[PDB]
Amino acid sequence: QPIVIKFSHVVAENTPKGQGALLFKKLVEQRLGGRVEVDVYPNSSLFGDGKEMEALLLGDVQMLAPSLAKFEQYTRKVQIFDLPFLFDDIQAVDRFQRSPQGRALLTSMQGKGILGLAYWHNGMKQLSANRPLLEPEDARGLKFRVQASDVLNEQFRQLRAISRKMSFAEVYQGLQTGVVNGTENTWSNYESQKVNEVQKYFTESNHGLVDYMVITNAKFWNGLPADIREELQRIMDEVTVQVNLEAERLNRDARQRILASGASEIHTLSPQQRADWRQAMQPVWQKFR
Template sequence: MRLFKPALTALSAAILMASTAVMADPITIKFSHVVAENTPKGQMGKKFQELVAERLGDQVAVELYPSSQLYGDDKVLEAMLLGDVQLAAPSLSKFQKYTDQLQVFDLPFLFKDIEAVERFQSSETGQSLLTALEPKGLVGLGYLHNGMKQLSASSPLTVPDDADGKKFRIMTSDVLEAQFDALDAVSLKKPFSEVFILLQTKAIDGQENTYSNIYSQKFFEVQPYITESNHGVLDYMVVSSARFWNGLPEEVRGEVKSALDEAIAYGNELSQAKNLEAKQAIIDSGQSEIITLDDAQRQQWVDAMKPVWGEFADDIGQDIIDAAQDANR
């Protein structure tokens, strides 16, 4: 029996190692975001989860935390740098504390439509902005559309003077604050998760958002007027921490990135359809009137807000603003 002991020991070790490999915990990717599951971002997250499961099986587990279940956009990047979250897609406004360059996306009336936004983001300049966060330990992995922003309020907003003195919730963004300053309005930086209550209790008079968010968050139920201004873009950057992303095994990272690219493309395809569906659902509800601006009225809004560009040209870079303008052509 002693002759077989080394062989048995080796065999046992091999079985133990194989069992340990099988039982090893999967790599967990916690994806935290603030919107509902039926939004373009929410659907992108589900698609990403499905694709990773198909391609990587038990190696990687994607966990989804929508509707600020884990963190709001104001805290998620800090949590990411601490390793508590591995993936997030905050609105582009949320990156101001990490880089000034992404403020270009907050400039009012810079992009004529979402197609122009797409052209800019796909351009050399737009792609280079994905790397702007690297000195802060974050990796930009792609852009995700939500859509063009509209203005909602407790009273009609037809010309800029209608906003005078009214309180609007904004994301944490100096550009958006300046945008409402230009209207002689009051801007309040509040988390997305608090907006409905603020509107319902009339602590604020209005807010800016896409149709899909206005509908999915039920803002239209407590805002009788929505002005179709298309004055800005609400998009997201999908990000991870450099430590987590670069620490993934190369083959796993390649598969995860491929799944993420496909999921982002899927979410972007959904965004326009979702906004159109949401707009129609709001109209059908009869709870909020959508105000359409004529050319003269719209030009008044442009004239009132466009001076904000000059205030931030040095911070953002005039070359970046010029490249964004070129995308309109």
């Protein structure tokens, strides 16, 4: 019987991570046919945000690629990636991730039985709401959905807003019902989940990022025949390049689809206007020294 790798994730198929998981499946089955099978479960069809890590540790799934914002229960070393305006752009993020210091974070949870294999990009985060977000004051009193991160909770509290941690699958319903009325995410995630249908206003703030750490269960990975593990890592490195090469494009395409939807508008910022948002949000770094 072949070795089965269930790769669960929470995003749509036509996204950076969705395409990366499928490419990993394709290349693995082409190079290790009959020896390894990759079973990809997108859109939280196997496990959502709230249960995927527990499943990985129990061996009920073999590969995940969660947002870097979602690891606080296992390590605090990755929450640096949540700090607003710490990285100007994805190139800056990449430089950190690829450095010795960034690569060291891949083993930050090894003591918990989790091994990081790679970083995958999605893109920069934008803001959305049911009212225009021109200047930081506009966020005051709103209710933002955030990923399950203390840093992101504090980010919106700094803007005198309410935050609500919610699993990614539930964002559309949360905004539709009104338990939240704004959020932050990449264009790709907004459009692929149709959240633009319940958010009339977007601001291209580029105030943070959504990137992933591809992870596996250490016992499972260490348990593989050496050749299979080594080949899987080489394939992973190749997939990472294709994901990282196309991520900006898919996000640009998504922005175009949002504009073509007819029901949302996008506000862009001057360098000065962006500096104003930075000035208002950067004080949150004082809570995470």
